[PDB]
Design an enzyme around this catalytic site. Structure first.
Site, PDB file in Angstrom:
ATOM      1  N   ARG A 124      30.986  45.007  29.591  1.00 20.51           N
ATOM      2  CA  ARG A 124      32.764  44.560  30.324  1.00 20.51           C
ATOM      3  C   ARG A 124      33.533  44.504  28.445  1.00 20.51           C
ATOM      4  NH1 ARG A 124      34.138  46.139  34.903  1.00 20.51           N
ATOM      5  NH2 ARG A 124      33.207  45.422  36.462  1.00 20.51           N
ATOM      6  N   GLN A 142      45.269  28.007  38.834  1.00 19.40           N
ATOM      7  CA  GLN A 142      46.610  28.372  38.145  1.00 19.40           C
ATOM      8  C   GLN A 142      46.475  26.989  37.242  1.00 19.40           C
ATOM      9  OE1 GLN A 142      49.534  25.743  40.499  1.00 19.40           O
ATOM     10  NE2 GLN A 142      51.711  26.657  39.092  1.00 19.40           N
ATOM     11  N   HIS A 199      46.870  27.999  32.853  1.00 18.07           N
ATOM     12  CA  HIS A 199      47.188  27.202  31.706  1.00 18.07           C
ATOM     13  C   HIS A 199      47.400  26.550  30.793  1.00 18.07           C
ATOM     14  CE1 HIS A 199      51.499  27.793  34.874  1.00 18.07           C
ATOM     15  NE2 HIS A 199      49.717  29.225  35.304  1.00 18.07           N
ATOM     16  N   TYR A 240      30.246  40.012  44.847  1.00 21.40           N
ATOM     17  CA  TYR A 240      28.909  39.911  44.749  1.00 21.40           C
ATOM     18  C   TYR A 240      27.642  38.978  45.565  1.00 21.40           C
ATOM     19  CZ  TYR A 240      30.651  42.257  40.643  1.00 21.40           C
ATOM     20  OH  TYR A 240      32.044  43.388  39.616  1.00 21.40           O
ATOM     21  N   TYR A 261      47.705  38.196  35.131  1.00 24.20           N
ATOM     22  CA  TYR A 261      47.609  36.731  36.248  1.00 24.20           C
ATOM     23  C   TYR A 261      48.743  36.257  37.036  1.00 24.20           C
ATOM     24  CZ  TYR A 261      42.419  34.766  36.184  1.00 24.20           C
ATOM     25  OH  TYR A 261      41.327  33.913  36.500  1.00 24.20           O
ATOM     26  N   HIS A 290      51.421  35.269  42.429  1.00 21.86           N
ATOM     27  CA  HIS A 290      52.048  34.846  43.136  1.00 21.86           C
ATOM     28  C   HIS A 290      51.760  34.698  44.429  1.00 21.86           C
ATOM     29  CE1 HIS A 290      53.673  33.580  39.198  1.00 21.86           C
ATOM     30  NE2 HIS A 290      53.499  33.240  39.547  1.00 21.86           N
ATOM     31  N   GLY A 313      40.852  42.545  34.636  1.00 25.23           N
ATOM     32  CA  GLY A 313      40.997  41.487  34.407  1.00 25.23           C
ATOM     33  C   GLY A 313      39.570  40.585  34.078  1.00 25.23           C
ATOM     34  N   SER A 315      38.118  38.653  30.825  1.00 29.81           N
ATOM     35  CA  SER A 315      37.998  37.136  31.380  1.00 29.81           C
ATOM     36  C   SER A 315      36.440  36.775  30.652  1.00 29.81           C
ATOM     37  CB  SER A 315      37.973  37.103  32.305  1.00 29.81           C
ATOM     38  OG  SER A 315      39.667  37.276  33.171  1.00 29.81           O
TER      39      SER A 315
HETATM   40  C1  COH Z   1      46.826  31.915  38.322  1.00 31.36           C
HETATM   41  C2  COH Z   1      47.544  32.609  39.707  1.00 31.36           C
HETATM   42  C3  COH Z   1      49.017  31.489  40.022  1.00 31.36           C
HETATM   43  C4  COH Z   1      49.499  30.392  40.822  1.00 31.36           C
HETATM   44  C5  COH Z   1      48.448  29.941  41.818  1.00 31.36           C
HETATM   45  C6  COH Z   1      50.829  30.212  40.872  1.00 31.36           C
HETATM   46  C7  COH Z   1      51.597  29.705  41.322  1.00 31.36           C
HETATM   47  C8  COH Z   1      52.890  28.694  41.060  1.00 31.36           C
HETATM   48  C9  COH Z   1      53.467  28.009  41.535  1.00 31.36           C
HETATM   49  C10 COH Z   1      53.724  27.005  42.908  1.00 31.36           C
HETATM   50  C11 COH Z   1      52.214  25.835  42.873  1.00 31.36           C
HETATM   51  C12 COH Z   1      54.786  27.821  40.951  1.00 31.36           C
HETATM   52  C13 COH Z   1      55.813  27.048  41.626  1.00 31.36           C
HETATM   53  C14 COH Z   1      54.802  28.475  40.279  1.00 31.36           C
HETATM   54  C15 COH Z   1      56.537  29.384  38.954  1.00 31.36           C
HETATM   55  C16 COH Z   1      56.071  29.684  37.972  1.00 31.36           C
HETATM   56  N1  COH Z   1      55.006  30.936  37.593  1.00 31.36           N
HETATM   57 CO1  COH Z   1      53.369  30.924  38.187  1.00 31.36          CO
HETATM   58  N2  COH Z   1      51.078  30.539  39.246  1.00 31.36           N
HETATM   59  C17 COH Z   1      49.967  31.554  38.824  1.00 31.36           C
HETATM   60  C18 COH Z   1      49.601  32.431  37.692  1.00 31.36           C
HETATM   61  C19 COH Z   1      50.624  32.208  36.844  1.00 31.36           C
HETATM   62  C20 COH Z   1      50.747  32.573  34.756  1.00 31.36           C
HETATM   63  C21 COH Z   1      49.098  33.146  34.516  1.00 31.36           C
HETATM   64  C22 COH Z   1      52.618  32.492  34.619  1.00 31.36           C
HETATM   65  C23 COH Z   1      53.073  32.798  32.994  1.00 31.36           C
HETATM   66  C24 COH Z   1      51.802  31.542  32.433  1.00 31.36           C
HETATM   67  C25 COH Z   1      52.754  31.581  31.149  1.00 31.36           C
HETATM   68  O1  COH Z   1      52.997  33.293  30.247  1.00 31.36           O
HETATM   69  O2  COH Z   1      53.002  29.936  30.324  1.00 31.36           O
HETATM   70  C26 COH Z   1      53.302  32.123  35.609  1.00 31.36           C
HETATM   71  C27 COH Z   1      54.638  32.000  35.374  1.00 31.36           C
HETATM   72  C28 COH Z   1      55.487  31.160  36.402  1.00 31.36           C
HETATM   73  C29 COH Z   1      56.819  30.869  35.893  1.00 31.36           C
HETATM   74  C30 COH Z   1      57.758  31.177  34.576  1.00 31.36           C
HETATM   75  C31 COH Z   1      57.985  30.039  33.904  1.00 31.36           C
HETATM   76  C32 COH Z   1      56.998  29.727  32.695  1.00 31.36           C
HETATM   77  O3  COH Z   1      56.755  29.113  32.327  1.00 31.36           O
HETATM   78  O4  COH Z   1      56.263  31.329  32.608  1.00 31.36           O
HETATM   79  C33 COH Z   1      57.532  29.993  36.998  1.00 31.36           C
HETATM   80  C34 COH Z   1      58.532  29.076  37.484  1.00 31.36           C
HETATM   81  N3  COH Z   1      52.202  32.165  36.766  1.00 31.36           N
HETATM   82  N4  COH Z   1      53.672  29.205  40.317  1.00 31.36           N
HETATM   83  C1  LIG Z   2      40.169  33.270  28.493  1.00 32.15           C
HETATM   84  C2  LIG Z   2      40.037  33.863  29.401  1.00 32.15           C
HETATM   85  C3  LIG Z   2      38.654  33.115  30.185  1.00 32.15           C
HETATM   86  C4  LIG Z   2      38.052  33.270  32.217  1.00 32.15           C
HETATM   87  C5  LIG Z   2      40.001  34.135  33.033  1.00 32.15           C
HETATM   88  C6  LIG Z   2      39.268  33.218  33.978  1.00 32.15           C
HETATM   89  C7  LIG Z   2      39.187  34.569  35.099  1.00 32.15           C
HETATM   90  C8  LIG Z   2      39.865  36.326  35.262  1.00 32.15           C
HETATM   91  C9  LIG Z   2      38.351  36.313  36.259  1.00 32.15           C
HETATM   92  C10 LIG Z   2      38.266  37.566  36.806  1.00 32.15           C
HETATM   93  C11 LIG Z   2      39.840  38.030  37.100  1.00 32.15           C
HETATM   94  C12 LIG Z   2      39.600  39.723  37.629  1.00 32.15           C
HETATM   95  C13 LIG Z   2      38.555  39.894  37.589  1.00 32.15           C
HETATM   96  C14 LIG Z   2      37.790  39.407  38.082  1.00 32.15           C
HETATM   97  C15 LIG Z   2      36.290  39.149  37.529  1.00 32.15           C
HETATM   98  C16 LIG Z   2      34.960  39.822  38.406  1.00 32.15           C
HETATM   99  C17 LIG Z   2      34.200  40.888  38.280  1.00 32.15           C
HETATM  100  C18 LIG Z   2      32.823  40.870  37.192  1.00 32.15           C
HETATM  101  O1  LIG Z   2      32.481  39.739  37.125  1.00 32.15           O
HETATM  102  O2  LIG Z   2      32.786  42.244  36.774  1.00 32.15           O
END
Ligand code: COH
Ligand SMILES: CC/C=C\C/C=C\C/C=C\CCCCCCCC(=O)O
Ligand code: COH
Ligand SMILES: *[C@@H]1O[C@H](CO)[C@@H](O[C@@H]2O[C@H](CO)[C@@H](O[C@H]3O[C@H](CO)[C@@H](O)[C@H](O)[C@@H]3O)[C@H](O)[C@H]2NC(C)=O)[C@H](O)[C@H]1NC(C)=O
Ligand SMILES: *[C@@H]1O[C@H](CO)[C@@H](O[C@@H]2O[C@H](CO)[C@@H](O)[C@H](O)[C@H]2NC(C)=O)[C@H](O)[C@H]1NC(C)=O
Ligand SMILES: *[C@@H]1O[C@H](CO)[C@@H](O[C@@H]2O[C@H](CO)[C@@H](O)[C@H](O)[C@H]2NC(C)=O)[C@H](O)[C@H]1NC(C)=O
Ligand SMILES: *[C@@H]1O[C@H](CO)[C@@H](O[C@@H]2O[C@H](CO)[C@@H](O)[C@H](O)[C@H]2NC(C)=O)[C@H](O)[C@H]1NC(C)=O
Ligand SMILES: CC/C=C\C/C=C\C/C=C\CCCCCCCC(=O)O
Ligand SMILES: CCCCCCCCO[C@@H]1O[C@H](CO)[C@@H](O)[C@H](O)[C@H]1O
Ligand SMILES: *[C@@H]1O[C@H](CO)[C@@H](O)[C@H](O)[C@H]1NC(C)=O
Ligand SMILES: *[C@@H]1O[C@H](CO)[C@@H](O)[C@H](O)[C@H]1NC(C)=O
Lengths: 551, 551
Positions: free
Chosen positions: A89, A172, A176, A324, A354, A357, A495, A499
């Site tokens: 990887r 999330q 972040h 897996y 990532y 949403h 990914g 990761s």
């Molecule tokens: C990892 C999975 C995941 C989940 C479960 C999730 C859940 C949720 C959620 C409900 C709890 C809300 C209200 C939002 C709302 C937002 N998300 Co996310 N987000 C996720 C991954 C991301 C990622 C990664 C970014 C980019 C963040 C950055 O670049 O600062 C993002 C960007 C955003 C932005 C843009 C603002 C910014 O600072 O870039 C908003 C608004 N969103 N999201």
């Molecule tokens: C700075 C980054 C460090 C960790 C990121 C954390 C989680 C992301 C993990 C996977 C993203 C999608 C692919 C999933 C990996 C599983 C497959 C494998 O193990 O080969």
């Protein structure tokens, strides 16, 4: 226009203009030669016919449960396999890093300036004739059309892998710390200058914020006690700036390392759990080292928590996502006789992929309540009302959404989904197929092959015309998922290198750091090597409710 | 007091307190075990019986010119030998880095904060009973007394290895890109956040400073033309801050990447040579690439000059210093199948050992004139009056001082020499003998053995009482030199690991960067791989005068 606009150089060969309308490909160490780096060296041709496809590897790792069960019980064998997962990887990631949104060639600026996300593929040059280079129409389809036709949720589609809300919030909260877009500067810039797992979302990005969050006694973080429960201190107490809309009452403005974490009560649940964990680690350390001061208690606990985080992310989180039957292992020693760079730079495309949403549910279901997005957002009263034990038990039971497969983005975040498309284009991302080739994957030969289906495929054909200009981000969300899986092949294959690189790249995993004395002795070191998502909740949440990442 | 005060753990074992009056040593991967990591494993017992001493290896490298002549022309052998040099020296340096002046245990703060110099040995704990731990008197001897009895020049001792003022000013110009102590914060802090060879002394440490030095046409750096000769532009023209006395004529206030380089015309000579080289590489690349704009011309020339710098440092500068008959080689590919970290953090002790005060002559002799320190300091008129050709011719012919052997620090810099002692003490450096053991050398068993002589040894015996508390910096300058050599064993054995590490650790040496496309194609790549101190002067100094680092 730039003579490289058509991306002529294959197989990780690099393209350079050599005149106004001629290019040369640099085929160094790619295992290929010829004008476009497509003539394989003999030994390469041998590798290519013996390389199994990623889909074959996936099949093997997700069947023969019985064989893997034996494999998982031979430490010698488990290590061998885990080592190969790591090495293969990581080889896909440039390290030291190369390109960024402003530099489609290597420069000292791009290497040395930590404010940029790095780029796995260089941007499409400003003067190219089409958005993807030379192929497709002069303009890409309206992103509102792409979003509405193939991305927006009609019925909720549950994740067939059983991912829960503990998992969605963990993803999330964890990601972040390293995806922290610096919007003053633009989508290709980050505020996470540590570029990985440094736990700044707990301890603060700068020394000043850390010092306001710390108690300066016993190595601890400040906190308040509400109804006998430990929670983060407030903004008013600490002077730590947080993002809250102006209607939030002073007593509800919790202060944590990451200033956006008051946005979402699932994010505050994790913030409060990790703050407890740090203080619990200080307590154990003080018992081991009654001679230590506050500063060393604090720094050693932070190292322990970084190790715990990596360990959970590999053996619970990635484990659960992978599907897996092989049991992945966090073991830094597996790399000690390999060539590996203990450093990482966060890639813009890793941030893009990532944007999960579709994982979000239509409502947040805690105990007997079903909160809308509008009631949940910003509302940490819900956390205090129900309490952490109820939050864990409710989120452990509630299923998340499927990410691949199309039409599963909740409408409540449609503007966020549209922004990911728009910002990808502002950042001049190359196409889906260029990204698939960058990661050793066959280009898709049709929309139907991408989706595995007919109706979304036909909408995309009408929107994009040519498969070779299909964009990366929407493709991740409409892609044919693996059988009963949350993701399609492109998500996994991009990914996973980003990761594993980011997890293993951490300095704590280096041979000079990975020793008991780094963690205050054998007790501190065992805390890392036995950590788990269950133990994290068990040690820090009243009643020790059961938990995992599946429903 | 801290139970690790006596430095009980040997062989790079790590010491940790385990209560108020007890310690544990961590012997992980040392090849030793037992309470203090002093019982060798079997293989270690064997590898120690077989290892030649540094002085044996130095002897072999400086004799048998006949054999070395053969080896130098068998490319496979030369590469095999250079490979071993790189790998064995680099292994001594922690990377990722560990301690710094405020952290004698590993911490995220010491890892992540680039404002600190790193530390090859942890500082002595603040509460130890003596300056060095537990040995010696309660106070170290007055630094002015050590300075006056064993450091100050009585009469000028010439370097028997023949180093000249081209060499001396090249050492000072080159090392001042990465030794830039932040006197606002303290001697354990640096303003050189790139931690190595990034040529910030040409281009500026910050982007704002770089942009003010740049012409923005053709990739070039701004300049002025005085009497038909190219010189750095002024402070007035550029608004780039430089350190100059109030009296300096406006037009002699030359502005260059490093703020302190107007201090010395020998430094301004090399600044001027390097500015010319950057613009000459711009002209070559513009010829090669008429399609390129100013930004890519500028960045690609910078990468090229970084390569030229590494090339000359290894094959001319280090070659000269080494005294070896073996021909050192700059070749990134020798590390491609080795375990090596492409990153570097500058050590406080590498700064301290590079305090090569005794190189300075009693006067600076150009053409017919013999300038005193007072006349030479801050005086760019002398550079303009004589011109660069005369500078090179005179400095090539003028011999520099011997560094080891004692009593050769010119009194004009006595205050700087005293500061090196006082600041070592403020940063709580461990002793010479602790440093020698850190780098696999036998501790000295007497003052006489250190110096090779009687009178200095007797003065030091009375000043310090115990050889185990003699201090690092003053030991490097009184140490018995190798036969007709400029340095003793301790200087070469600490210096070589830090040097080669920072040289090869640069990203341009990594496999993703070490490719002709990085440098604008074969033409730019060749500029690097054929650079020398001679071609540097030949290309950039009118009349192409002969030069070398000796005579
Ligand atoms: C990892 C999975 C995941 C989940 C479960 C999730 C859940 C949720 C959620 C409900 C709890 C809300 C209200 C939002 C709302 C937002 N998300 Co996310 N987000 C996720 C991954 C991301 C990622 C990664 C970014 C980019 C963040 C950055 O670049 O600062 C993002 C960007 C955003 C932005 C843009 C603002 C910014 O600072 O870039 C908003 C608004 N969103 N999201
Ligand atoms: C700075 C980054 C460090 C960790 C990121 C954390 C989680 C992301 C993990 C996977 C993203 C999608 C692919 C999933 C990996 C599983 C497959 C494998 O193990 O080969
Ligand atoms: C490498 C050989 C070398 C030479 C030839 C040389 C020649 C000269 C010279 C000739 C005109 C003068 C006037 C001085 C005077 C000074 N030297 Co140098 N120095 C050298 C190696 C160093 C190093 C290394 C430092 C520490 C630099 C830093 O940390 O900023 C230094 C520090 C200094 C400082 C203040 C910075 C500090 O850290 O204390 C002054 C002032 N000196 N020196
Ligand atoms: C790297 O480490 C440096 C040494 O710790 C550090 O400098 C220090 O920064 C702090 C906190 O920002 C300054 O102290 C200030 O602390 C409180 C905070 O509320 C102020 O109100 C005080 O008045 C005080 O000014 C230190 O003075 C400063 N120490 C120095 C310069 O020696 C850097 O900040 C760290 N760099 C990074 C990127 O973290
Ligand atoms: C190199 O790859 C390039 C870039 O695609 C090829 O050039 C194109 O090839 C197609 C098909 O042969 C033709 O339309 C043109 O000859 C090329 N297009 C342009 C704009 O020149 C090229 O043929 C490949 N070269 C080799 C030697 O395989
Ligand atoms: C490890 O080192 C310690 C501390 O340096 C040794 O303690 C000393 O050992 C002998 C006792 O026979 C004497 O030279 C000293 O008087 C002791 N000093 C102290 C402070 O105890 C210890 O013996 C070493 N351990 C081993 C097993 O070699
Ligand atoms: C990293 O690069 C960014 C973008 O170039 C730099 O940010 C800019 O700084 C410049 C020059 O000083 C300013 O004119 C602008 O305010 C910034 N532009 C932006 C934010 O897009 C940043 O300074 C660089 N960082 C470092 C350490 O050099
Ligand atoms: C940032 C680090 C980069 C470069 C270091 C620059 C100069 C160092 C040179 C000399 C210090 C004493 C080293 C003598 C080394 C010769 C012996 C050998 O090569 O093994
Ligand atoms: C060059 C500056 C000399 C300052 C004199 C104060 C230190 C005197 O120091 C003495 O110097 C003598 C003369 O070389 C030596 O013979 C002695 O061994 C030494 O201790
Ligand atoms: C916040 O959630 C609580 C439940 O604790 C609810 O009663 C309240 O109405 C919500 N507030 C908003 C603004 O939606
Ligand atoms: C500076 O150098 C000039 C010669 O270029 C010299 O004659 C003059 O005396 C020097 N100035 C000082 C202040 O020493």
């Amino acid at each position: 226009h730039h003579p490289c606009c058509s991306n002529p150089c294959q197989n990780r060969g690099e393209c350079m203009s050599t005149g106004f309308d001629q290019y040369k490909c640099d085929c160094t160490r790619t295992g290929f030669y010829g004008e476009n780096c497509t003539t394989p060296e003999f030994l390469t041709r041998i590798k290519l016919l013996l390389k199994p496809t990623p889909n074959t590897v996936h099949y093997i790792l997700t069947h023969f449960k019985g064989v893997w069960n034996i494999v998982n019980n031979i430490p010698f064998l488990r290590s061998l396999i885990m080592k190969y997962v790591l090495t293969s990887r990581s080889y896909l990631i440039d390290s030291p890093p190369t390109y960024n949104v402003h530099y489609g060639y290597k420069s000292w600026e791009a290497f040395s300036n930590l404010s940029y996300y790095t780029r796995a593929l260089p941007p499409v040059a400003d003067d190219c004739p089409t958005p993807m280079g030379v192929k497709g129409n002069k303009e890409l389809p309206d992103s509102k059309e792409v979003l509405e036709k193939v991305l927006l949720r009609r019925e909720f589609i549950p994740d067939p892998q059983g991912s829960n809300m503990m998992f969605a919030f963990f993803a999330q909260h964890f990601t972040h710390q390293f995806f922290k877009t610096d919007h003053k500067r633009g989508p290709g810039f980050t505020r996470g200058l540590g570029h990985g797992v440094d736990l700044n979302h707990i301890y603060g990005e700068t020394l000043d914020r850390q010092h306001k969050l710390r108690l300066f006694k016993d190595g601890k973080l400040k906190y308040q006690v509400i109804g006998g429960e430990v929670y983060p201190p407030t903004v008013k107490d600490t002077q730590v700036e947080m993002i809250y809309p102006p209607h939030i009452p002073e007593n509800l403005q919790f202060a944590v390392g990451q200033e956006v974490f008051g946005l979402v009560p699932g994010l505050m649940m994790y913030a409060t759990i990790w703050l407890r964990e740090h203080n619990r680690v200080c307590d154990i350390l003080k018992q081991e080292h009654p001679e230590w001061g506050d500063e060393q208690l604090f720094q050693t606990s932070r190292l322990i928590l970084i190790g715990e985080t990596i360990k959970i992310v590999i053996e619970d989180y990635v484990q659960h996502l992978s599907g897996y039957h092989f049991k992945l292992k966090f073991d830094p020693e597996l790399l000690f006789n390999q060539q590996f760079q203990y450093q990482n730079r966060i890639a813009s495309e890793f941030n893009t992929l990532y944007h999960w949403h579709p994982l979000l549910p239509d409502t947040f279901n805690i105990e007997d309540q079903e909160y809308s997005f509008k009631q949940f957002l910003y509302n940490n009263s819900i956390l205090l009302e129900h309490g952490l034990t109820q939050f864990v038990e409710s989120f452990t039971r509630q299923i998340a959404g499927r990410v691949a497969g199309g039409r599963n983005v909740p409408i409540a975040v449609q503007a966020v989904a549209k922004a990911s498309i728009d910002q990808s284009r502002e950042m001049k991302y190359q196409s889906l197929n260029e990204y698939r080739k960058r990661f050793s994957l066959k280009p898709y030969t049709s929309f139907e092959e991408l989706t595995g289906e007919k109706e979304m495929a036909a909408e995309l054909k009408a929107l994009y015309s040519d498969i070779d200009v299909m964009e990366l981000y929407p493709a991740l969300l409409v892609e044919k998922p693996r059988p009963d899986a949350i993701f399609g092949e492109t998500m996994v294959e991009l990914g996973a290198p980003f990761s594993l690189k980011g997890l293993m790249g951490n300095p704590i995993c280096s041979p000079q750091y990975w020793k008991p004395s780094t963690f205050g002795g054998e007790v501190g070191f065992k805390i890392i090597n036995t950590a788990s998502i269950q133990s994290l909740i068990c040690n820090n949440v009243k009643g020790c409710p059961f938990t995992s990442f599946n429903v």
